[PDB]
Amino acid sequence: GAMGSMERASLIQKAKLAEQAERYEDMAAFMKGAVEKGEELSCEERNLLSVAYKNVVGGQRAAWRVLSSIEQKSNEEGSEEKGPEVREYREKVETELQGVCDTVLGLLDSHLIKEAGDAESRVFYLKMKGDYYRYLAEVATGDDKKRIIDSARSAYQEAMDISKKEMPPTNPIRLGLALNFSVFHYEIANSPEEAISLAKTTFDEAMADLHTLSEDSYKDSTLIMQLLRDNLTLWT
């Protein structure tokens, strides 16, 4: 690891600077170095890790979709042959995306998840595991597409079980987990009815628990509840 010689605290400080500079690849490399120091992550540190990789993979996903759309158009009737270049470059981006997903899943498996005992950390990492299997699922087409989908489902399910037992319905981690699992159902598992049911039930149970919250907690929860509502509006 190229970050092996830098102090954990310096890696975290630089992750924060990289975020401020919108240098998300750097931010991710710094956080990977911090994880590899072997200590558990604080809540702030977990969010630095997720913010970094979400931005990196998010750009890769956006590029993959652009290229995939061009590729599909070139494979319609009446399209002029352009050669292998569109497929090759789509494959290049896809391979880089899969590499990032494998890196994140590797950190979670060595050894973030197994050391996470508190609900807030364990649910956070299992949600991440679901998310990065979902990104692999978005590009998968071969003999392991079903296994990738089930790996995503399994991670999300375990996170949901813990979150329902150990967190209030308004907890932002629990809310974001449900939002994303609902999208998994809609976009990956071809289960739009499960997607809609989950989003609705999550929204309504959070609504009923908002009265217990401070003004700052209320803002955090209602922000994610609005995303649930936005998706429901898109889907109904």
């Binding site: 999208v183 809609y186 995303l227």
Partner: peptide
Amino acid sequence: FPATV
């Protein structure tokens, strides 16, 4: 695309 966090 739908919203995720």
